[PDB]
Amino acid sequence: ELQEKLIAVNRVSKTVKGGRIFSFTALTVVGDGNGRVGFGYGKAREVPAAIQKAMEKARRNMINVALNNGTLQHPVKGVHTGSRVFMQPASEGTGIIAGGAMRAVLEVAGVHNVLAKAYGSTNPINVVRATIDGLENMNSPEMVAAKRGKSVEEILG
């Protein structure tokens, strides 16, 4: 019911007095498929422990995003540390059109539409922080009407 998904695994080194000592860094995202997303980075000496420490970090770092019956509300930019993530509302887009580390964070959000495009850097670690940043700042018409207009009807035509 949480729909876990690992994205990428990278091997890093420390270069100590004895020599190179290696370590593994993972990148996982979780999400119930109804509007909640969350990522955990994680790092350990071996791959299964580096994955598992990313299992727990993502669960406690979940954020809530309101969805328009399975798609996002409006087109939005998602700039975060050289990664210019942009997505269009794509009403009934019939399949996730998204790139690397773009599909995993979106299919756990609970979507099957919207087109995506990533500009600038394509680093997996930054773009998954770019997608959540683009998702969280979005507002739906039921709370746009609260902050301005004081009416749900006239703000959407």
Partner RNA sequence: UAGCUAGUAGGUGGGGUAACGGCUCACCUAGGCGACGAUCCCUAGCUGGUCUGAGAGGAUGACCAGCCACACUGGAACUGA
Partner RNA sequence: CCCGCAGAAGAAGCACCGGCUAACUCCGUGCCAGCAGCCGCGGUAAUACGGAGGGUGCAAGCGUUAAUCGGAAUUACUGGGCGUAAAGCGCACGCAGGCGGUUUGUUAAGUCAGAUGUGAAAUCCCCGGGCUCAACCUGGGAACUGCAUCUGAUACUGGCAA
Position 75 contacts RNA (CB under 7 A): no
Closest to another protein by CB, 29 or 96 = 96
Q: Which is nearer to another protein, 56 or 101 (CB)?
A: 101
- 120: contact with RNA by CB under 7 A: yes
Q: Of 24, 68, 31, nearest to 46 (Cα)? A: 24
CB 120 within 8 A of CB 84: yes
Q: Which residues pair with 38 in a beta bridge?
A: 30
Nearest C-alpha neighbor of 7 from the set 82, 87, 84, 99: 99
| Binding residues for another protein (CB under 8 A) | 73-75, 89, 92, 94-97, 103, 112, 137, 139, 141, 144, 146-150, 155-157
Instruction: Decide which of RNA, another protein, none touches 96; Cβ closer than 5 to 8 Å per partner kind.
Output: another protein
The C-alpha atoms of residue 32 and residue 76 are separated, in whole angstroms, by: 23
**Which positions touch RNA (CB under 7 A)?**
84, 86, 119-120
